[PDB]
């Protein structure tokens, strides 16, 4: 925050609240869109009933949800069962704040973000650990071990790739030289589109985000069809809704973060209207990810650990040292345009034999 202003604490608050409830309506309507987009992929139709577009069905659903009877299991730790859903949502919502959707002053006088800070990615990392805390904790809190085991599979896997995200994030930091999202973005304004320079790390970041419930590992798990996922399976009315809510906000936070960092989110080469583009990129990754949600198999997490731990993460720190070598010896930043382009040429061509 060398170059960027601060709105008064009341306005920071108000913006925070707007972003939270905005994220509420966001998650619900996103559930509708994925329902139907999936329906198109599998050549059926969505829910038009309880319409008009079918888009009043989160009202109906939320309405079921509350008035549903929130059940607290005995044989569940009384304090932890309640507290668990609380944690998972709190640490999910926060840190979508940081993401700038526009230049300063452009919020109608103020600030497209909520908070910016000076240490950016670390905040994200920090908040990311704590949701997982919520996961394995709920697994305990429920005090059904069937729930536990799954929560443990979950946590082990998540934590694995969660490590992956860091060594992913190292490379682009070298180039920009800042821990701030606005600076990274602006770096992409001038030198342009970090994934041009950073590509392998782009790959390992994205796929690292597969672990965080994104689908294609999925021995996350959802309880479905396996040794269950754990955390949900013991909760009913509001609390269950809270867990689902958190996992989805994380999904869109990631769909925002991917353009924000490696691409130029907002801050596109041309047109450069402030909000619309970040929402569009969000939409792009969101849709592509939904395709991923539908159209690919599971890992078992035996493999998922193999894939992230054995493949993604070593690959991640390998590229870091390369970009470290390049930035340390100051050569040009061109060598990374060339290198990333070339590595992309490799990591693609070996698919089509």
């Amino acid at each position: 925050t060398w170059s960027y202003p601060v709105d008064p604490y009341w306005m920071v608050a108000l913006k925070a609240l707007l972003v939270v409830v905005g994220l509420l309506t966001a998650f619900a309507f996103m559930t509708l869109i994925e329902r139907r987009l999936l329906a198109r992929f599998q050549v059926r139709m969505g829910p038009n009933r309880v319409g008009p577009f079918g888009l009043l069905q989160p009202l109906a659903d939320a309405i079921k949800s509350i008035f549903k009877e929130d059940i607290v299991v005995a044989q569940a730790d009384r304090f932890l069962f309640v507290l668990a859903p609380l944690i998972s949502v709190v640490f999910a919502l926060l840190a979508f704040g940081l993401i700038p959707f526009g230049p300063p002053g452009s919020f109608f006088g103020y600030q497209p973000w909520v908070i910016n800070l000076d240490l950016g990615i670390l905040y994200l990392f920090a908040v990311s650990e704590l949701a997982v805390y919520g996961i394995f904790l709920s697994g305990w809190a429920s005090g059904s071990k069937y729930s536990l085991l799954g929560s443990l599979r979950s946590s082990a896997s998540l934590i694995s790739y969660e490590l992956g995200l860091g060594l992913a994030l190292l490379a682009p930091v070298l180039l920009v030289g800042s821990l701030n999202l606005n600076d990274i973005v602006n770096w992409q304004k001038e030198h342009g589109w970090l994934f041009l320079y950073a590509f392998p790390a782009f790959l390992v970041y994205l796929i690292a985000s597969m672990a965080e419930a994104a689908r294609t590992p999925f021995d996350l798990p959802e309880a479905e069809q396996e040794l269950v996922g754990g955390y949900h399976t013991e909760y009913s009315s509001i609390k269950w809704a809270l867990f689902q809510m958190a996992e989805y906000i994380h999904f869109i936070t990631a769909s925002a973060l991917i353009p924000t960092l490696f691409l130029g989110g907002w801050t596109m080469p041309v047109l450069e209207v402030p909000y619309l583009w970040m929402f569009l990129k969000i939409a792009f990754f969101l849709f592509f990810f939904i395709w991923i949600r539908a159209t690919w198999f599971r890992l078992r997490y035996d493999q998922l650990l193999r894939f992230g731990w054995g493949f993604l993460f070593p690959l991640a720190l390998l590229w870091f040292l390369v970009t470290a070598l390049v930035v340390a010896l100051d050569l040009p930043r061109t060598y990374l345009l060339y290198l990333s382009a070339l590595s992309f040429l490799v990591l693609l061509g070996a698919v089509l034999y």
Binding site: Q42, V43, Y146, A294, T295
Partner: protein, 180 residues
């Protein structure tokens, strides 16, 4: 960990109960426990006419039912020494194999879903729907069709069955390949 995979949950398919003797992520031994669907045909059917039984035959394997129909019809015909007409036999091979395509379509639909992911249940379901529409056309029923008879079959095929079997016989080669 002798893990108890329940009767109907969690997605251990078709109401089986499994005592997975299992420590860790492997599987030591699963001690299977059945009997949850026991309807008791072998007794009930001792109380039904040989004709009446033909309504109870499709009902066990409900996916490939006509194999039940065929097996039972045959064993009785043999036992009472009946002579099945060629066109009936042909229709019975057609229906048997069509019911087979239905069953198989189901098997791989569920299989692909069971571990792995959701999408291809639907295409198999589309082809199965064309098959079930064939069955409805000829027998008036989706399944459990009371059609096969100890003589032969209940009645003849309507005008519209032939054209529709072709349609599916046309898409299926391309179609089966798509699943493949």
């Amino acid at each position: 960990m002798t893990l108890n995979v329940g009767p109907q949950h969690p997605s251990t398919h078709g109401v089986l109960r499994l005592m997975v003797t299992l420590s860790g992520e492997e599987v030591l031994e699963v001690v299977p426990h059945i009997g949850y669907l026991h309807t008791g045909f072998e007794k009930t059917m001792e109380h039904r006419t040989y004709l009446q039984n033909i309504t109870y035959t499709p009902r066990m394997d409900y996916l490939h039912s006509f194999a039940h129909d065929l097996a039972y019809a045959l064993a009785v015909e043999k036992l009472l020494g009946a002579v099945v007409p060629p066109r009936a036999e042909t229709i019975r091979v057609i229906l048997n194999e069509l019911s087979r395509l239905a069953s198989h379509l189901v098997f791989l639909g569920t299989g692909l879903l069971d571990l792995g992911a959701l999408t291809p249940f639907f295409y198999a379901f589309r082809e199965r729907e064309t098959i079930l529409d064939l069955f409805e056309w000829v027998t008036g029923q989706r399944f459990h069709h009371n059609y096969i008879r100890i003589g032969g079959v209940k009645e003849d095929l309507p005008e519209e069955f032939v054209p529709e079997l072709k349609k599916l016989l046309e898409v299926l080669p391309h179609r089966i390949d798509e699943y493949e």
